Structure formats: C-alpha cells, structure tokens
Amino acid sequence: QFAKPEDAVKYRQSAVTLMASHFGRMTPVVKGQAPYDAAQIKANVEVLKTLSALPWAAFGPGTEGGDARPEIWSDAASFKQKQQAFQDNIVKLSAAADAGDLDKLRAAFGDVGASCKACHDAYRKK
Amino acid sequence: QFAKPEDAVKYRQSAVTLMASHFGRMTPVVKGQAPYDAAQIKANVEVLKTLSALPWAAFGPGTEGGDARPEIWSDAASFKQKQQAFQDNIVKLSAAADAGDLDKLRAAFGDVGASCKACHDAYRKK
Numbered sequence A, B: 001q002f003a004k005p006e007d008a009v010k011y012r013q014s015a016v017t018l019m020a021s022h023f024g025r026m027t028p029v030v031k032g033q034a035p036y037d038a039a040q041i042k043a044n045v046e047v048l049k050t051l052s053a054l055p056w057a058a059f060g061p062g063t064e065g066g067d068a069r070p071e072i073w074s075d076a077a078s079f080k081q082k083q084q085a086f087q088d089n090i091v092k093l094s095a096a097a098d099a100g101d102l103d104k105l106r107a108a109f110g111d112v113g114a115s116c117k118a119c120h121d122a123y124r125k126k
Ligand code: HEC
Pocket: A009, A012, A013, A014, A016, A017, A019, A020, A021, A023, A065, A066, A067, A068, A069, A079, A082, A083, A086, A112, A113, A115, A116, A117, A119, A120, A123, A124
C-alpha cells in the first residue's frame, strides 16, 4: 500500500506509536496507581489487539529505513518469530482482560512488555 | 493518557496517518485499477473502523497544537458533529464492505472521503 519505502517507514512508526500508547497507558492500572475497571481495560486491549497486528506488513521487502535494523530482512525468519511471539503474548493479554482478572492482567502485561523489549534489543537501531 | 499535550498531538497525527493509509489504499480498488476481493476489503474496513474512532480522544482539553485549528476547542459541538458524521459514514462503508458490493463500496467510499475533507476545511491549519 506504500508508494515509496518512506511511506512504509512513516506507517510503521505511526503504528508502533499508537500501540505504545495503548499498552503504556495501562501501566498505572497494572501498578494499582489508577483504578481497575474491567470493561475499560477489555475495550482498550481490543484496540491494542488490532493495532499490534499492523506494523509487521510495513516491513515488506525493500522498505529498509527509519530505525529498523537491516537484520529484519536478512533474518526474516528470526524477525517473524519475534513478531509472532509478541502477538501471541497479546493473545494472553486479551484473555486476561476478557476474564476481568487484575492478577492475570499484570502477569500478561509484563510478558507483553518483555516481548516489545526483546524485539527492540535485536532489530531496533539504538 | 498523555503526559504532556505534545504527546496528544503525536498520537492524533499517528492515528490519522494510519487511518489515511487504510482508507487511501482502497482507492485503486474503488476505481477498478486493482481487483476487488470482498474478504480483503471487509477485513481492511474493519481495521479502518477501529482506527477511525481513535483520533478524537486526543483532542482533549488543553491539547492545542500541531495542525489543529483552535476552533476545535472553542466550537466543541461543531467539531463533535464533524467527527460523528465522519464515523457514521464509516458505518455505511462497513455495511457496504460486509455486503461484498462494489457499487455500494464506491458510493460509501466517496462519502467518507468528503467527510475527511469537510473536517479539514474547517479544523485543519492549511
Ligand atoms: C519487532 C517484532 C517489534 C516488536 C514486538 C515491537 N516493536 Fe517497537 N519497533 C520495532 C522496530 C523495528 C522499530 C523501528 C521502526 C522504524 O522503522 O523506525 C520500532 C519502533 C518503536 C517505537 C518508536 C517509533 C517512533 O516513531 O519513534 C516505539 C515507541 C515502539 N517501537 C514501541 C513498542 C512497544 C510499546 C511494543 C510492544 C507493545 C513494541 N514496540 C513492540 C520493532 C518491534
């Protein structure tokens, strides 16, 4: 869907920006600093689920640029693995949110955050 | 969810960037320059539906900046009207996509694009 590779860069940066906001805005809730409203979180995690699927299609072939390391393309199977692990952890977070269980939500949230960091440590230019 | 108003600006710009891509990527399909796959479009319009709800909450009070005109806040009822008309037209586009009907899709797509433009003409700094 991108006329030029820069367009893919701008898309994926916007997608991870929105993902980061929908993930990170729950930090005060997981920590107990903000109240836990099960329906609020269920709805937010549904948004995060949609968003978390979107960046990966904007790392198509020839879309090198931004802060993506070139390893994303030369090691396509390792990157796909990191994306799928991340989205599988999103599935666990959805299940926690849908169950309305703050303890499960906390655990799942920390697993998702670790899978964000693991991808960045390997595939994001510092 | 925004620590500073700039964060709201960066969110809403990313949200409308993603919305614009999910809308505009269908242009070749509506024009017949690319094939029409009903399931492909249904799924894309589901993504667009989610995204089209997201910018508006990032124009909260005190979040003046970017290319938003100040009129968004002083005329809150007129802006809300423009957002709701836009999202109602998104509902019509979802119904067309869910029906698998290219003629209805075409019509609905042009209504959505007109409601993008109408908001920009009043509320987006040139
Ligand atoms: C790989 C499988 C990733 C996962 C999982 C997550 N992110 Fe990431 N992110 C990744 C890359 C390769 C990049 C660089 C993109 C580019 O072309 O520049 C990023 C970038 C970010 C950013 C910065 C965006 C900006 O516009 O500056 C943020 C804020 C970010 N990523 C956040 C983030 C979060 C919170 C994640 C899990 C919920 C997450 N990312 C996962 C690769 C990958």
